[PDB]
Design an enzyme around this catalytic site. Structure first.
Site, short mmCIF file in Angstrom:
data_model
loop_
_atom_site.label_atom_id
_atom_site.label_comp_id
_atom_site.label_asym_id
_atom_site.label_seq_id
_atom_site.Cartn_x
_atom_site.Cartn_y
_atom_site.Cartn_z
N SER A 42 0.76 -1.29 0.04
CA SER A 42 -0.15 0.02 -0.02
C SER A 42 0.92 1.23 0.00
CB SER A 42 -1.07 -0.12 1.16
OG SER A 42 -2.00 -0.81 0.96
N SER A 100 -5.57 2.42 4.37
CA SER A 100 -4.71 1.30 3.52
C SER A 100 -5.97 0.38 2.75
CB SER A 100 -3.88 0.47 3.91
OG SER A 100 -2.79 1.28 4.43
N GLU A 140 -5.38 -4.04 -6.08
CA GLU A 140 -5.52 -4.68 -5.01
C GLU A 140 -6.73 -5.97 -5.23
OE1 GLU A 140 -4.16 -4.19 -2.49
OE2 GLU A 140 -3.01 -2.29 -2.45
N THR A 209 2.21 3.14 5.10
CA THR A 209 2.41 1.73 5.40
C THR A 209 2.19 0.94 4.22
OG1 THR A 209 0.57 1.38 6.31
CG2 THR A 209 2.40 2.08 7.74
N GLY A 210 2.67 -0.07 4.02
CA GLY A 210 2.57 -1.25 3.41
C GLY A 210 2.50 -2.53 3.83
N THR A 211 1.71 -3.64 3.67
CA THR A 211 1.96 -5.04 4.35
C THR A 211 1.47 -5.68 3.17
OG1 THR A 211 1.37 -4.06 6.50
CG2 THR A 211 0.91 -6.13 6.21
C1 LIG Z 1 0.79 -6.28 13.25
N1 LIG Z 1 0.67 -5.88 11.82
N2 LIG Z 1 0.75 -4.76 11.30
N3 LIG Z 1 0.20 -4.64 10.23
N4 LIG Z 1 -0.22 -5.75 9.98
C2 LIG Z 1 0.00 -6.55 10.86
S1 LIG Z 1 -0.89 -8.01 11.21
C3 LIG Z 1 -1.11 -8.43 9.43
C4 LIG Z 1 -2.66 -8.43 9.22
C5 LIG Z 1 -3.42 -9.44 9.90
C6 LIG Z 1 -2.81 -10.51 10.59
O1 LIG Z 1 -3.72 -11.34 10.85
O2 LIG Z 1 -2.02 -10.96 11.26
N5 LIG Z 1 -4.58 -9.35 9.62
C7 LIG Z 1 -5.91 -10.14 10.15
O3 LIG Z 1 -6.29 -10.84 11.00
C8 LIG Z 1 -6.73 -9.15 9.29
N6 LIG Z 1 -7.70 -8.35 9.76
C9 LIG Z 1 -8.48 -7.73 8.85
O4 LIG Z 1 -8.54 -8.04 7.68
C10 LIG Z 1 -9.30 -6.63 9.20
O5 LIG Z 1 -9.96 -6.87 10.55
C11 LIG Z 1 -8.79 -5.42 9.54
C12 LIG Z 1 -7.78 -4.85 8.58
C13 LIG Z 1 -7.21 -3.42 9.11
C14 LIG Z 1 -7.69 -2.79 9.91
C15 LIG Z 1 -8.59 -3.38 10.79
C16 LIG Z 1 -9.21 -4.72 10.70
C17 LIG Z 1 -5.54 -8.43 8.60
S2 LIG Z 1 -5.04 -7.02 9.11
C18 LIG Z 1 -2.98 -7.23 8.30
C1 LIG Z 2 -3.40 -1.29 10.44
N1 LIG Z 2 -3.33 -2.39 10.74
N2 LIG Z 2 -3.88 -3.00 11.62
N3 LIG Z 2 -3.49 -4.17 11.62
N4 LIG Z 2 -2.91 -4.54 10.89
C2 LIG Z 2 -2.76 -3.53 10.08
S1 LIG Z 2 -1.83 -3.50 8.76
C3 LIG Z 2 -2.13 -2.06 7.79
C4 LIG Z 2 -2.72 -2.46 6.38
C5 LIG Z 2 -1.91 -2.36 5.28
C6 LIG Z 2 -0.40 -1.34 5.47
O1 LIG Z 2 -0.99 -0.12 4.97
O2 LIG Z 2 0.56 -1.77 6.00
N5 LIG Z 2 -2.18 -2.57 3.94
C7 LIG Z 2 -1.60 -2.73 2.81
O3 LIG Z 2 -0.52 -2.59 2.40
C8 LIG Z 2 -2.80 -3.73 2.28
N6 LIG Z 2 -2.50 -5.20 1.95
C9 LIG Z 2 -3.17 -5.99 1.78
O4 LIG Z 2 -4.47 -5.76 1.62
C10 LIG Z 2 -2.98 -7.57 1.72
O5 LIG Z 2 -3.58 -7.91 0.77
C11 LIG Z 2 -2.56 -8.09 2.73
C12 LIG Z 2 -2.80 -8.00 4.03
C13 LIG Z 2 -2.46 -8.70 5.06
C14 LIG Z 2 -1.47 -9.60 4.90
C15 LIG Z 2 -1.09 -10.12 3.86
C16 LIG Z 2 -1.42 -9.14 2.67
C17 LIG Z 2 -3.52 -3.34 3.73
S2 LIG Z 2 -3.62 -4.91 4.98
C18 LIG Z 2 -3.92 -3.58 6.18
#
Ligand SMILES: Cn1nnnc1SCC1=C(C(=O)O)N2C(=O)[C@@H](NC(=O)[C@@H](O)c3ccccc3)[C@H]2SC1
Ligand SMILES: Cn1nnnc1SCC1=C(C(=O)O)N2C(=O)[C@@H](NC(=O)[C@H](O)c3ccccc3)[C@H]2SC1
Ligand SMILES: Cn1nnnc1SCC1=C(C(=O)O)N2C(=O)[C@@H](NC(=O)[C@@H](O)c3ccccc3)[C@H]2SC1
Ligand SMILES: Cn1nnnc1SCC1=C(C(=O)O)N2C(=O)[C@@H](NC(=O)[C@@H](O)c3ccccc3)[C@H]2SC1
Ligand SMILES: Cn1nnnc1SCC1=C(C(=O)O)N2C(=O)[C@@H](NC(=O)[C@H](O)c3ccccc3)[C@H]2SC1
EC number: 3.5.2.6
Length: 265
Positions: A42, A100, A140, A209-211
């Site tokens: 992202s 994101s 996406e 950020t990106g993830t």
């Molecule tokens: C610690 N960190 N930092 N950034 N990413 C991470 S953990 C990676 C990650 C995980 C995981 O399981 O580990 N996810 C969920 O669980 C999914 N939740 C949602 O899809 C959804 O509830 C949601 C998405 C965004 C905001 C609020 C709710 C996604 S969110 C991405």
């Molecule tokens: C804020 N937060 N709270 N908890 N976890 C979070 S992480 C914040 C967040 C970011 C980001 O900007 O770092 N994202 C992406 O980059 C998008 N990635 C994807 O949609 C993706 O396909 C994916 C998502 C998760 C795992 C593997 C692949 C989304 S996911 C949410």
């Protein structure tokens, strides 16, 4: 030595880490794997919003975009809630940066238009800023999924830092549009545990950020010292050793940023 510290972090997190901070008049560039490719994830939303702002009059922010069930196919915390009413371009920019929101990013790509659902025009925007490295190829969620080493949907810490520098500190956007971009990044909700965590509280941090899959975790930021001296910080990471389902490790970015902050303080 920074490089030794960064290499230690790679071993700790079973990760590949990339770092770039552009030189200033008094600080050398900080570089570690800075010219290696990493997935955008992202982080591309920041220059995407800049492209849409640049392309249109500011009142384009008030244009209502409608979308439907088949448009929600990625994490979209805001767009999922507003599907019954639509979202304005300004609301989409806000969601794309601050949450994101993947649907918001896809709709903004479509607004930019042209081949590849807007991805070619996005890449063209980066080319116009002198970035001959980065590329966007998918929307996406697919852009988060390319296998380790694949060049699709990649940038480098060096490339994205120079792009963000022009967008935030340079003159890529007129001040009115620049302020919209900068304020959305300032109000980001997703970055507290990344670059922000590595800088002392009296430094200002704005970021995107990106993830992604394969343990991908990125953060791109502009930071200001307590006396107003700015630096651009790009940190990118992945964890190919854990395969597709490897968890992103925010702490790797926080630690890398702490090391950078030690040098810049
Ligand atoms: C610690 N960190 N930092 N950034 N990413 C991470 S953990 C990676 C990650 C995980 C995981 O399981 O580990 N996810 C969920 O669980 C999914 N939740 C949602 O899809 C959804 O509830 C949601 C998405 C965004 C905001 C609020 C709710 C996604 S969110 C991405
Ligand atoms: C804020 N937060 N709270 N908890 N976890 C979070 S992480 C914040 C967040 C970011 C980001 O900007 O770092 N994202 C992406 O980059 C998008 N990635 C994807 O949609 C993706 O396909 C994916 C998502 C998760 C795992 C593997 C692949 C989304 S996911 C949410
Ligand atoms: C950035 N900001 N926001 N709130 N508090 C702050 S820190 C104070 C501040 C510093 C400084 O050295 O302290 N600045 C710069 O660096 C100069 N320009 C930009 O940052 C600039 O490219 C931009 C101009 C207009 C809109 C958006 C971005 C100025 S702006 C004022
Ligand atoms: C090598 N090792 N040995 N002990 N601890 C480690 S590394 C610590 C650790 C990591 C990490 O970040 O390194 N994780 C993931 O990434 C997460 N996996 C998943 O979310 C997912 O694949 C899953 C969810 C549920 C059931 C099965 C799989 C967790 S597993 C804990
Ligand atoms: C809105 N919200 N609430 N809490 N955090 C949030 S922010 C979004 C988010 C959610 C969520 O709920 O969307 N998460 C989970 O679900 C957790 N996932 C895991 O820990 C993880 O993948 C796991 C590893 C090993 C075994 C099992 C699961 C986190 S990741 C952050």
């Amino acid at each position: 030595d920074l490089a030794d510290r960064f290499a230690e972090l790679e071993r700790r997190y079973d990760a590949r880490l990339g770092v770039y901070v552009p030189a200033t008049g008094t600080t050398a560039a900080i570089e570690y794997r800075a010219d290696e490719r990493f997935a955008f994830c992202s982080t591309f939303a920041a220059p995407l919003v800049a492209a849409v702002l640049h392309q249109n009059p500011l009142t384009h922010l008030d244009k209502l975009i409608t979308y439907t069930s088949d448009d929600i196919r990625s994490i979209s915390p805001v767009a999922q809630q507003h599907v019954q009413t639509g979202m304005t371009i300004g609301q989409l920019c806000d969601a794309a940066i601050r949450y994101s929101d993947g649907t918001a990013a896809n709709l903004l790509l479509a607004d930019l238009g042209g081949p590849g659902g807007g991805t070619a025009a996005f890449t063209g925007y980066l080319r116009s800023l002198g970035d001959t490295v980065s590329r966007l190829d998918a929307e996406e969620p697919e852009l988060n999924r390319d296998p380790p080493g694949d060049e699709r949907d990649t940038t480098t810490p060096h490339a994205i830092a120079l792009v963000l520098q022009q967008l935030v500190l340079g003159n890529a956007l007129p001040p009115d549009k620049r302020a919209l971009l900068t304020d959305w990044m300032a109000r980001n909700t997703t970055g507290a545990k990344r670059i922000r965590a590595g800088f002392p509280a009296d430094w200002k941090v704005i970021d995107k950020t990106g993830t992604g899959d394969y343990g991908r975790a990125n953060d791109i930021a502009v930071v200001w010292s307590p006396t107003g001296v700015p630096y651009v910080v790009a940190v990118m990471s992945d964890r190919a050793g854990g395969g597709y389902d490897a968890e992103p490790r925010e702490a790797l970015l926080a630690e890398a940023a702490t090391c950078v902050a030690g040098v810049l303080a």
